[PDB]
Nucleic acid binder design. Structure first.
Lengths: 58, 842
RNA sequence: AUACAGUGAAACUGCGAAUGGCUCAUUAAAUCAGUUAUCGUUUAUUUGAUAGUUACAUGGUAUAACUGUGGUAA
RNA sequence: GAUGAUUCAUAAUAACUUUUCGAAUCGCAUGGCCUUGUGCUGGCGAUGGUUCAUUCAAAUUUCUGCCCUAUCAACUUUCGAUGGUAGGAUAGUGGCCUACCAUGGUUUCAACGGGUCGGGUCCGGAGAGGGAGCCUGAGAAACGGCUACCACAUCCAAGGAAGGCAGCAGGCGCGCAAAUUACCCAAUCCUAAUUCAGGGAGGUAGUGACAAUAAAUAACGAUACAGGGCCCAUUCGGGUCUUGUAAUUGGAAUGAGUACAAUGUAAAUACCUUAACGAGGAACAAUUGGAGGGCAAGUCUGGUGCCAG
């Protein structure tokens, strides 16, 4: 039944409208703002123990 | 009623419209209840999608049984949506071990129940079965698995670590998922977790070029039979082009021509070959040969030949007849097809070994050439048209540069064809690309111009450096580029490489990584990469911990193998290390980089050069120098390789001694495995000598049993390598004993001696010394003859071969490129020396 | 209730499930209606009769239910 | 001893047995004695057991018993027919079956053949995937179970797994039509370690112009206003007198119903009884069939106006 709600999911127009320690971790993780790639960009890796920090590969 | 985040419906709809697959990772105990809803969003998106669902689990399903009859009975002793789904939809349940069964079938979905047990092969094996617009779900329900994710998000550096497996593959996966644009990480409440890369997904506008380039081609060739009918069967532009190229070779009629078809699995090679075979039939080619490791694999090829026959108007039982095998082993596989249209034309299967039959061959099709030994395929390359198909990263397949190594061997006119587009889904599907980064499957070695400008580094200047595994696999952009480079060097050098090894090098603790870097003066480019695994008493503690877990991890092959052959308890105690793999770039092969590295490797564990763990709930240097880390105390160095003259030549020059040779040749290579040892200075060495003599005595007797295929020169080499082992021993304790007169009497009767003298006098015929040659070869190569009797390499090879490998003399003439008469002449010269030697004893 | 004594899931024993119900295809002494015998027979059960020819109590030659470890899609 | 009649009953001797049986059981009570030991001796039941008889039955078996028949005169003997002997088996008699022997057995008084569920709701007879072989039990060749087979068909991860009611209701068989997949074991009976468990045995209720029995849908007055009403007769005409309302109006009776109840019943419906309400269009509005009229600025048709159909 497309128009009718089957199970607990109903779609109208283009919108789908459904029925429904870790929880501290999900909500905190839900609040994360910057991406992983953005986190990597600021970080440079010391190739050599005493060498310069290389940030971006050419 | 809760509204779903617009990201989830948008991405799924986008993938369906673009026929691109997507990834969802659901975290939560109730995650299973979300799986029903997610699928319904597909079927709403498109009804043409495949409905079959793949379910993979390790041992147990999550709270339900796949037996309907039980499920009713369990209910007996209104439904939730979850069981409604398990009822109506077609779900195929899979144990992680039995991933081979799933390689052929297609599924709208794959569900990965257990994240911790995920493996590279299993992950690669499941996803490619998913169709364009399909979805991949990974169920991250374990509480610990949740813990790692949370640590990863707060900081990308600090690694959560529980109380020996580092399991490093599991988190690089996590970070890689964050990179994927079509991956979404979600909870059991459908909240989009921002760790995903699919953060700014927007719904694409409502609605491919390849189909246009494929469609247009078909009408243009429609009138050109037999091409039009055959090209119609093609599914992709590349597939059509490959078929056209095959037709071009068929038209050229040049019998010195070879066509190489290279593609990944599922790209439709067999269809291209099967169609091309049908093309040769209509063209007029009479004798068709097809060869493969087994005829069972050729079922798809033969099926697609007949569909081409259907396209060409050929009809079964009038134009052509099909013959199937009578042997139970091939399971009634099709062996021969006899065609009667306009003349007698024959398609027949042959075993790769029976190359003698190909003298009359006008074309042979070699399917899955990666699986046949290199000696066999070169014999199969005769004066006729050759079609060759080799899989890259499909089934076991072979290393990429082996496919190349065949190419430089071809460098006989050769034509190269590559099929890149898949026939199952849209090109450039993100998951396959995202797979490709993670497993580094398509990494390609790149010639470095900077090497040429400053020249190839002389080996002495190159210095070996230890590599920190934690920092490699941190998924840092610099670290990854090093991973691809070393992995590029990995996959190239050695014969075969499975996808699981990536997990092995990373997580297993005993494995250590060494790389021969160029002298320092940009990301350094490895010249040689060395991976060592510590086996001995050091590994016992880990093994006992595995025993405590109940799940014995890995195996000490060599403490085991040596134990079985010689039953020496000391070796099991002796700590040591084994070089799993020496990788040197083939183009810089023969410059001695590898020999330099092992020499430095030899020195490092000898102590001549005498915490970096990531934080456990900023990263250490990528590579560490030999001095900076203390070596473990080692007694010996061991190696694994199949007996090849180049490798065995490589090893012997580096002072290793053989200890065992496998009688049974490995089926996949056709090669016999070797274990070859070397004792480090300052550590006891007598036990090596005891085995090397035994292996020598073992090897000499086993020359004919299974090694008779080996060349005499190759045989002579390994005894020489074994003989070097006693030279290592300056001690005079263990020694050969010269033959006593009594022993000579027992082995040969007086009548035996008299006839031998006749030969030294030329009075008696060769065949009448059939029997005594083997013992004589046993006696001489046992060194029983002593200093008195000596021979050059060729004579030793001749005597070894007749006596111990047991050929006729004429066979030796061809191997040594010596005409038969002289081979008799040198042999008689050999005979006279010992006919003399026995006399002085008398 | 210092053997238990109460009822009592489960299990082992004992009894019963050839009664009752339903349709009419068949077969012209075939069943059948009356009639006769069983000195030519078997018969749970009922009822009445009926067996003087280590023991202050033998064994597991015994296990169910039950406890616990597993396999299987089942 | 018994019968009309016994190799019947019963008794005895000699052996025989893969050969029995002759309480290693339970509940309730704790009396009478004394030799105080928990010493001896003990009351009522239950479940068991040999044989006989009785009862419940079964199995064979004797004689008799309404269709047309010769255009059905021969029928068995053609894998026992008739009989005898011995054996096997049966619960036993028995060509029931086996080994030898004899050549018979029915029939013109109708054998043999042909045509056309039984008797009186009751008593009997028969049958429930196909066929073959076994299984327990007092009673089965079991509507139960097992083996192999012949087909049908269900599932699977494809390695296997398992499957057989017109009895009760509810269905299909037309494209055209019909009672509920209802309630209870309270009754009467039946089975059990049994008062107490059960029984689609049965009972209760549900539907309906197939049939059958009884009867509502009104009963009683008053007033006003008019002179025709009715019968016979082909004909003309004749005969008879309190009638008509298509008029108004009054007070009583009560059923369907609706229902406080009680009763009824396993419970419940229904019946019966019974508070309150419940009638003038008593609109609280039964039908079915048949015989005639008459009417238009209406319509159609044939004509010898104005007619006729």
């Amino acid at each position: 039944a497309p128009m009718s709600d089957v199970g607990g999911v109903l779609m109208d127009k283009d919108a789908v409208y459904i029925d429904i320690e870790g929880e501290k971790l999900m909500t905190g993780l839900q609040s994360v703002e910057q991406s992983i790639a953005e986190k990597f960009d600021g970080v440079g890796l010391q190739l050599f123990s005493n060498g310069t920090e290389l940030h971006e590969v050419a | 009623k809760k509204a779903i985040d617009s990201r989830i419906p948008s991405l799924i709809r986008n993938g369906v419209q673009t026929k691109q697959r997507s990834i969802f990772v659901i975290v939560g105990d109730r995650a299973r209840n979300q799986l029903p809803n997610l699928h319904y969003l597909m079927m709403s998106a498109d009804l043409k999608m495949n409905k079959s669902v793949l379910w993979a689990y390790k041992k147990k399903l999550l709270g339900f049984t796949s037996h309907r009859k039980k499920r009713e009975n369990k209910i007996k002793k209104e439904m939730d949506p979850f069981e409604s789904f398990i009822s109506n939809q077609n779900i195929r349940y899979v144990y992680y071990k039995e991933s081979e069964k799933i390689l052929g079938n297609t599924y709208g979905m794959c569900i990965l129940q257990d994240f911790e047990a995920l493996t590279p092969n299993l992950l690669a094996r499941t996803i490619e079965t998913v169709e364009g617009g399909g979805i991949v779900v990974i169920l991250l329900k374990s509480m610990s698995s949740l813990k790692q994710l949370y640590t990863m998000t707060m900081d990308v550096h600090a690694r959560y670590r529980t109380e020996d497996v580092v399991a490093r593959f599991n988190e690089r996966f996590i970070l890689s998922l964050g990179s994927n644009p079509n991956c979404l990480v979600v909870d059991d409440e459908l909240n989009v977790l921002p760790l995903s890369g699919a953060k700014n997904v927007k719904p694409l506008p409502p609605k491919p070029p390849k189909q246009l380039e494929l469609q247009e081609l078909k009408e243009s060739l429609e009138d050109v039979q037999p091409a039009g009918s055959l090209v119609s069967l093609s599914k992709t532009v590349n597939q059509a082009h490959a078929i056209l190229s095959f037709i071009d070779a068929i038209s050229e009629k040049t019998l010195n021509f070879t066509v190489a078809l290279t593609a990944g699995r599922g790209r439709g090679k067999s269809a291209a070959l099967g169609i091309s075979i049908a093309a040769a039939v209509s063209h007029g080619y009479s004798n068709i040969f097809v060869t493969s490791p087994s005829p069972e694999n050729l079922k798809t090829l033969f099926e697609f030949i007949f569909k081409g026959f259907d396209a060409l108007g050929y009809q079964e039982h009038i134009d052509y007849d099909i013959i199937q095998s009578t042997n139970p082993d091939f399971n009634k596989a099709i062996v021969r097809v006899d065609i009667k249209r306009d003349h007698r034309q024959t398609i027949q299967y042959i075993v790769p070994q029976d190359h003698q039959v190909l003298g009359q061959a006008e074309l042979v099709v070699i399917d899955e050439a990666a699986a046949i030994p290199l000696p066999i395929v070169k014999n199969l390359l005769g004066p006729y048209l050759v079609f060759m198909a080799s899989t890259i990263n499909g089934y076991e397949g072979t290393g990429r540069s082996l496919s190349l190594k065949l190419i430089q061997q071809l460098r006989r006119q050769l034509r190269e064809i590559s099929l890149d587009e898949p026939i199952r889904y849209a090109p450039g599907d993100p998951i396959e690309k995202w797979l490709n980064k993670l497993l580094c499957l398509d990494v390609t070695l790149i010639k470095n111009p900077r090497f040429a400008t400053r020249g190839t580094p002389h080996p002495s200047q190159c210095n070996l450096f230890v590599v920190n595994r934690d920092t490699l696999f941190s998924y840092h952009p610099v670290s990854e580029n090093f991973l691809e480079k070393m992995m590029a060097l990995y996959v190239s050098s050695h014969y075969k490489n499975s996808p699981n090894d990536l997990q092995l090098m990373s997580d297993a603790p005993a494995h250590k990584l060494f790389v021969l870097l160029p002298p320092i003066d940009r990301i350094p480019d490895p010249l040689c990469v060395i991976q060592i695994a510590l086996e001995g008493e050091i590994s016992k503690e880990s093994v006992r911990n595995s025993l405590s877990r109940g799940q014995r991890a890995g195996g000490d092959l060599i403490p085991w193998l040596i134990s079985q052959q010689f039953q020496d308890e000391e070796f099991a105690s002796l700590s040591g290390a084994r070089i799993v793999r020496i990788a040197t770039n083939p183009e810089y092969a023969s410059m001695g980089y590898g020999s330099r590295a092992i020499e430095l490797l030899r020195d490092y564990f000898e102590g001549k050069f005498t915490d970096y763990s990531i934080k456990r709930v900023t990263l250490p240097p990528l590579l560490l120098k030999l001095s900076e880390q203390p070596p473990h105390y080692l007694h010996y160095l061991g190696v694994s390789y199949g007996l090849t003259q180049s490798l065995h030549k490589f090893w012997k020059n580096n002072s290793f001694v053989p200890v065992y040779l496998r009688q049974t040749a490995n089926d996949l290579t056709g090669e016999h495995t070797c274990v070859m040892l070397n004792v480090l200075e300052g550590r006891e060495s007598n036990w090596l000598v005891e085995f090397a003599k035994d292996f020598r005595k073992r090897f000499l007797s086993l020359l004919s049993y299974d090694f008779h295929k080996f060349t005499a020169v190759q045989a002579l080499s390994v005894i020489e390598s074994s003989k070097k082992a006693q030279d290592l021993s300056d001690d005079e304790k263990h020694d050969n004993k010269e033959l006593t007169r009594t022993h000579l009497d027992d082995i040969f009767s007086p009548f035996d001696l008299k006839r031998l003298d006749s030969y030294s006098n030329n009075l008696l015929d060769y065949h009448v010394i059939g029997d005594m040659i083997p013992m004589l070869a046993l006696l001489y190569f046992g060194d029983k003859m002593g200093d008195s009797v000596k021979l050059s390499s060729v004579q030793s090879a001749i005597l070894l071969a007749i006596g111990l490998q047991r050929k006729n003399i004429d066979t030796i003439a061809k191997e040594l490129n010596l005409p038969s008469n002289q081979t008799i002449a040198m042999f008689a010269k050999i005979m006279r020396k010992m006919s003399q030697y026995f006399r002085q004893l008398l």
